[PDB]
Amino acid sequence: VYFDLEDLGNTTGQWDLYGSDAPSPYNSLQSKFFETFAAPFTKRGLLLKFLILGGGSTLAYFSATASGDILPIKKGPQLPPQLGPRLG
């Protein structure tokens, strides 16, 4: 029946429509590879700190060491400074 006060998940359509539920198609040794190597990143708070500080310092690095051949803002003006309307 489509209405049952005992099972409301069925009654309210709370299903996994495309969930496979099959076992892993990933073979092991590959799995153990990624399980041992991605393990340090599976602590969400620690990962948040590593991303904010790591990405932040990374940004600071590529910003501090940028070359004028990449950014015109580091290259600076290369022309003789022009003259204002009435002033300098």
Binding site: L48, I52, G56, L59, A60, S63, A64, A66, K74
Partner: peptide, 30 residues
């Protein structure tokens, strides 16, 4: 040199940290 440090600091890092933090405080449940 210093603007190349502080412009991304307050224009990228600070808004990301503040938005993430405020997001957490705003979504918290006691």
């Amino acid at each position: 040199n210093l603007p190349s440090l502080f412009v991304p600091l307050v224009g990228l890092l600070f808004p990301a940290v503040a938005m993430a933090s405020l997001f957490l405080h705003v979504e918290k449940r006691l």
